Structure 1
Amino acid sequence: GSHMRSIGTTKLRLVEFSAFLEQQRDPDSYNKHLFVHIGHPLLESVDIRQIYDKFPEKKGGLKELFGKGPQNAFFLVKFWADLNCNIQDAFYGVTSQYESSENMTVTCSTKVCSFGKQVVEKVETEYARFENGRFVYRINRSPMCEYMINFIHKLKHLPEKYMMNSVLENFTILLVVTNRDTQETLLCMACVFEVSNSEHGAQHHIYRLVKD
């Protein structure tokens, strides 16, 4: 069953994350819609054996990554996406911010999966910047992959939330941040999705990934 406890200490902390659509009305006016967001503790656990088939397995996959550890850097992130927006013609992007006490060069790998099979992998490397006593790794306007744009358009062409949930059930993202110089895994977020029913918009719940 669930095991609820603190993370402890990780070398890298995710502080902010957002996936958005920004549409220009005129050169001085921009409307932004957030699909999901984090950052705008005791954590429960999810057994990794409950999610193996939803993520790429075999060479370089989730079970192999988890076996190499450190296991306290592995999490399952549930998202409740906000698809309530009007798509017209626009920048689909992602923001993120990580922090660490160590100056590192980090590589972020985002793998988009369909039925547990990798369809896209985006790879971005970022050097550290010292700010207010720590090292910060911030990406301001990282473009979404083409697959995501078409997937969002597909979701919005469905009349009801239960239909969007059925499409989202087999869509996952595996986000892995690695120290480029040593190849150590700094953070791994296994992301699952559903549509948000809340009037407060997008929601999320983070769990620790455990094997027992």
Structure 2
Amino acid sequence: RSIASSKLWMLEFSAFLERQQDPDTYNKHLFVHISYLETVDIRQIYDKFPEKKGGLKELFERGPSNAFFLVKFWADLNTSAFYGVSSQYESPENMIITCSTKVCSFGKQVVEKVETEYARYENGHYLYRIHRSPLCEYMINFIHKLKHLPEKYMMNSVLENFTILQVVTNRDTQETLLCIAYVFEVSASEHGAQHHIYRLVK
């Protein structure tokens, strides 16, 4: 139904551009946004993500398999400036979790960010949150470069070798709680950001 394993549920995800007009006025543009699931054979995407060491094939083999999703974004790129990322997770357990985000060009890791997040109790469950985390410089320049390509065919061709892997882990037990693979296209002119969510299998 949703991006949820037995132990973690992603409630919200977004990457955005924020501009301050005056001290009382803000404008925000969402590049991508998440607030029955077809499946995708994980062997079809192995080469788009790093392997060898902490690889995507090794991660899935160790499982659990109900924690591996693929998100396909049609990103809206139609736009001093703050570039950020926000996410929110729910769990029925109070744990200390770790989020590893790896940006890859051509299946080769290029940026890595690790973050630790703690729970807040709310109405019987536990919330984890990344708020207005600064988008790193590689991504900001990549977006600027994308917007400078001559046509959407060149942007989407470039984006075919751009992926992000997110692994969320229980810091104590090292259990994989959520693993999300992200593939991207540019949304078509006045379509706005859209996505499909898949379960990864086999």
Q: Which TM class, normalised by the smaller chain length?
A: over 0.9
Residue identity opposite 1:50 in structure 2:
Q
* C-alpha separation in 2, matches of 1:8 and 1:163: 34
Aligned to 1:67: 61
- 1:32 corresponds to 2:28: yes
User: In the aligned structure 2, how far is the partner of 1:143 from the partner of 1:132?
Assistant: 30
The CA deviation string for residues 90-111 of structure 1, in whole angstroms up to 9 with x for no partner, is: 1110010000000011111110
**Runs (5+) with no aligned partner, structure 2:** none
**Amino acid in the other structure paired with 1:199:** E
Report the residue type matching 1:22 in the other structure: E
In 2 relative to 1, CA 146–193 (structure 1 residues): closer, same or farther, beyond 3 Å?
A: same
Determine what percentage of the aligned residue pairs are the same residue.
85
Match of 1:134 in 2: 125
Equivalent residue for 2:135, pick from 123, 144, 148 = 144
Kindly report structure 1 stretches of 4+ aligned residues shifted beyond 4 Å.
5-9
Distance of aligned partners of 1:70 and 1:163 in 2 relative to their CA distance in 1, 3 Å threshold: same
* Corresponding pairs, count: 202
Alpha-carbon distance between aligned partners in 1 of 2:67 and 2:24, rounded to the nearest angstrom: 41
TM-score where L is the length of structure 1: 0.91
TM-score normalised to structure 2 length:
0.96
Change (3 A) 1:119 1:7: closer
Quick one: distance in 2 between partners of 1:6 and 1:82? Answer: 22
Q: Report what 2:169 is aligned to.
A: 178
CA contact (8 A) 1:17 1:97 kept: yes
CA shift in 2, pair 1:78/1:6, >3 Å? closer
Are 2:188 and 1:197 aligned? yes
Letter paired with 1:51: I
Other-structure match for 2:147: 156
Answer yes or no: is the 8 Å Cα contact 2:78–2:189 preserved in 1: no
Tell me if the contact between 2:102 and 2:164 (Cα under 8 Å) persists in the aligned partners.
Answer: yes
The CA deviation string for residues 151-203 of structure 1, in whole angstroms up to 9 with x for no partner, is 01001112321111011110000011000111100000011000111634100
1:115 alignment partner in structure 2: 106
Offset at residue 28 of structure 1 (A): 1.5
CA RMSD of aligned residues (A): 1.6
Q: Which residue number corresponds to residue 82 of structure 2?
A: 91
Hey, what's the Cα distance between the residues in 2 that align with 1:134 and 1:121?
Answer: 29
Q: Which runs of 5+ in 1 are unaligned?
A: none
Gap change, CA 1:6 and 1:79, over 3 Å in 2: closer
Distance 1:116-1:9 versus aligned 2 partners, 3 A rule: closer
Question: Is 1:56 aligned to residue 50 of structure 2?
Answer: yes
Q: Counterpart of 1:122 in 2: which secondary structure?
A: strand
User: Residue 57 of structure 1 aligns to a residue in which SS?
Assistant: coil
